[PDB]
Design a protein around this ligand. Structure first.
Ligand SMILES: Nc1ncnc2c1ncn2[C@@H]1O[C@H](COP(=O)(O)OP(=O)(O)O)[C@@H](O)[C@H]1O
Ligand SMILES: Nc1ncnc2c1ncn2[C@@H]1O[C@H](COP(=O)(O)OP(=O)(O)O)[C@@H](O)[C@H]1O
Ligand SMILES: [Ca+2]
Ligand SMILES: [Ca+2]
Ligand SMILES: [Mg+2]
Ligand SMILES: [Mg+2]
Lengths: 355, 330
């Protein structure tokens, strides 16, 4: 294999942006938070842009509020650096984008529009687009030497790289002005929409097109994507010891390679390393002899054999990824016997990530 | 105490919800197999255009047609319907407004994709309306075409809005035939002919969403069926031995003695390692039991499925169907 050295990547200030990617439910948020807290322990002035921390983790970071801006995470006085954190507010980031380009006066109308509030702000790819927009806002202010980026959950790891551009092209469709804000084909389509859709909804939709007054959205998604191509950007792919998560990680690694984007390596999270060298065949047989003959000893053997079978699946899954990607540095992170929802649990996770 | 009360056998429409990644697609297919057993005909429906049925059965994308995808036990049949929202919108324009011509012209300029995307209420009207059509469909002899309909439904965060027919219709044109059909959809959803099943994992977020969804659905007076606890694991330890091991207490003297009996003598680094392996297992079980306790408050039937050791294949769907059948699902 090849061992990923997250500690050396974090300590090197030429690394300015660290993007934590992969499928949802693998440990992206906690990895992002553990990495950011570590960089701060190394002396760096860091900001972690979290997407969806679990309630207890968000409270431990002091980011359980409705804010859409970084706040300082108070740490032990010995800590030489600074940790700053926030949780993305998708709707508020859309408001900020609308105001930045339309101005505060015209933004009052757009923000009050019922079609904007109920439809435009919840379209597919908004979470990825707004994460990218916020990353852009963090970079422009130059308030930190390191930005750790958490990415929205999805069954598809590539949605982070593709969904903003996809949403952007949908927003720039000819169909918005033509069908809401005459022709043979466009006229037929306009008639069909008038016949089926509510007059109030169509008025709010056409008002939104007139009010917004934007290839604006695709051009925004394109410029913001180019920020990921700046020198000092590192991508970290996170995966659980599961086939779907690894396949998503592999798809992401391929894309980074095709696009010549720097990949730090893979975080193979939730592993079950064997703490006892006793073979699986011997453990089952030792438990089976006890079954025919103290229920504690046989159950203890059944735990170990079950863990060993789990460890065998993990090793063959990883060897499949490593065989296909022999150039990719990897770090195995064991499943910790507690929830990663406090600063002390983040510290223990960062110890696993940086060894 | 039963996971499937008798009343659930009279249900014609089964909606399978749950948080993303909990097993809705897998369990909706296993439920469909269970209900089709004994020469019955069940329809398995998906509504998000994700082609999850084709992916589950490892086949190319399914067209907008009801097609036999699996043979259930003793001559039963499971049909599949991957609803195509674009084709459902054209069907609606043509049947209700005679705008089949306008519709066909819209498809050639991507305007059907647009209309369904910009109007989420129209989307839900088309989907729940098609679901209702499969449920009430009669054959030549005035008998139901399907014995049951199983819907691989939207997740826990979207299920209440998806079944909110009053809110979906509110953003549609006043009058016409749609407003009359919507009454029949509401009546079906709120009756004893429907049940919403909620798939969960013994993890904090899937359990929280299950509770939040049940509350929202109860407020809407929508019928709850069962809570299905997926991917269960073996405890391996008796309640007293587990409670102690979760604190770091596994008596080694008893463990060392039972190992000598089986002809096993471990060194100090392997014996200590074997002990922390069971402590960590017991810590995982205890935490899972603490999460599961939050469901005890609901006076809702509960079903349990095991973990399929490797990837879910066709044979795994039959094992999960068999697990459901043994729990009284019929
Ligand atoms: N190595 C680990 N050991 C134990 N628990 C972990 C580990 N990594 C993550 N977790 C837990 O897994 C869950 C999912 O992690 P999270 O970072 O929110 O994932 P994601 O953002 O990928 O969905 C959380 O409850 C977290 O505490
Ligand atoms: N009982 C089970 N044992 C093992 N794997 C399972 C089980 N149920 C589901 N899975 C797997 O878990 C993942 C998520 O399940 P899926 O049915 O696609 O969930 P959902 O439709 O709720 O997103 C899939 O990879 C699936 O094969
Ligand atoms: Ca310093
Ligand atoms: Ca993009
Ligand atoms: Mg996350
Ligand atoms: Mg699914």
């Amino acid at each position: 294999p090849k061992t990923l050295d997250m500690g050396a990547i974090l300590a090197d200030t030429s690394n300015r942006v660290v993007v934590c990617c992969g499928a949802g439910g693998v440990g992206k948020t906690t990895t992002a938070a553990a990495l950011a807290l570590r960089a701060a322990e190394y002396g760096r002035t860091v900001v972690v842009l979290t997407i969806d921390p679990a309630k207890r983790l968000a409270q431990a970071l002091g980011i359980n509020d409705l804010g859409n801006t970084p706040q300082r995470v108070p740490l032990a006085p010995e800590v030489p650096g600074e940790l700053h954190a926030m949780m993305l507010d998708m709707r508020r980031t859309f408001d900020e984008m609308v105001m930045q380009y339309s101005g505060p006066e015209r933004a009052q109308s757009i923000l009050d529009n019922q079609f904007y509030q109920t439809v435009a702000t919840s379209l597919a790819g908004t979470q990825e687009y707004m994460a990218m927009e916020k990353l852009g806002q963090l970079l422009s202010q130059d308030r930190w030497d390191l930005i750790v980026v958490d990415t929205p959950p999805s069954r598809n790891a590539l949605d982070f790289l593709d969904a903003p551009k996809r949403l952007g092209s949908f927003m720039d469709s000819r169909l918005w002005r033509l069908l809401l804000a005459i022709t043979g084909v466009m006229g037929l389509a306009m008639k069909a929409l008038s016949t089926v859709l509510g007059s109030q909804m169509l008025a709010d939709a056409a008002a939104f097109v007139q009010s917004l007054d934007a290839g604006g959205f695709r051009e925004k998604a394109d410029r913001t994507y180019a920020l990921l191509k700046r020198r000092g950007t590192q991508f970290v792919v996170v995966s659980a010891a599961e086939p779907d998560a690894l396949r998503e990680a592999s798809f992401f690694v391929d894309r980074l390679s095709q696009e010549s984007m720097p990949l730090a390596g893979l975080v193979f999270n939730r592993t079950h390393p064997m703490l006892c060298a006793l073979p699986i065949e011997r453990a089952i047989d030792a438990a089976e002899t006890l079954d025919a003959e103290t229920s504690l000893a046989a159950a203890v053997l059944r735990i170990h054999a079950e863990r060993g079978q789990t460890a065998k699946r993990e090793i063959r899954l990883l060897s499949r990824f490593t065989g296909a990607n022999p150039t990719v540095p990897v770090v195995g992170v064991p499943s910790l016997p507690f929830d990663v929802s406090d600063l002390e649990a983040l510290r223990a996770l960062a110890d696993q990530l940086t060894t | 105490s039963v996971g499937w009360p008798s009343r659930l056998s009279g249900v014609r429409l089964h909606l399978v919800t749950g948080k993303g990644g909990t097993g809705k697609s897998t369990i909706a297919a296993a439920l469909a197999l269970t209900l089709a057993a004994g020469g019955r005909k069940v329809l398995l429906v998906e509504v998000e255009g994700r082609q999850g049925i084709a992916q589950l059965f490892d086949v190319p994308p399914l067209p907008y047609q009801e097609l036999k995808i699996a043979t259930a036990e003793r001559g039963g049949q499971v049909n599949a319907l991957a609803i195509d929202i674009e084709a459902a919108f054209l069907e609606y324009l043509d049947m209700f407004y005679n705008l089949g011509i306008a519709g066909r012209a819209m498809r050639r300029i991507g305007a059907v994709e647009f209309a369904t995307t910009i109007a989420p209420g129209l989307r839900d009207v088309l989907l729940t309306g098609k679901i209702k059509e499969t449920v009430v469909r009669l054959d030549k002899n005035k008998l139901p075409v399907y014995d049951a309909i199983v819907v691989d439904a939207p997740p826990t965060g979207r299920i209440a809005r998806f079944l909110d027919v009053t809110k979906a219709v509110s953003d549609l044109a006043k009058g016409g035939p749609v407003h009359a059909q919507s009454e029949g959809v509401v009546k079906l959803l709120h009756s004893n002919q429907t049940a919403i099943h909620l798939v969960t994992l013994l993890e904090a977020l899937p359990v929280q969403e299950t509770l939040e969804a049940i509350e929202e659905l109860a407020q809407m007076e929508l019928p709850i069926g069962s809570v299905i606890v997926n991917r269960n694991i073996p405890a391996h330890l008796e309640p007293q031995d587990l409670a102690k091991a979760a604190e770091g207490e596994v008596d080694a003297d008893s463990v060392r003695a039972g190992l000598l009996t089986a002809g096993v003598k471990l060194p100090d680094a392997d014996f200590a390692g074997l002990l922390t392996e069971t402590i960590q297992h017991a810590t995982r079980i205890t935490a899972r039991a603490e999460i599961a306790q939050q469901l005890d408050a609901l006076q809702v039937p509960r079903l349990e499925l095991p973990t399929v050791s490797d990837g879910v294949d066709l044979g795994s769907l039959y094992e999960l169907s068999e697990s459901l059948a043994q729990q009284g699902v019929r």
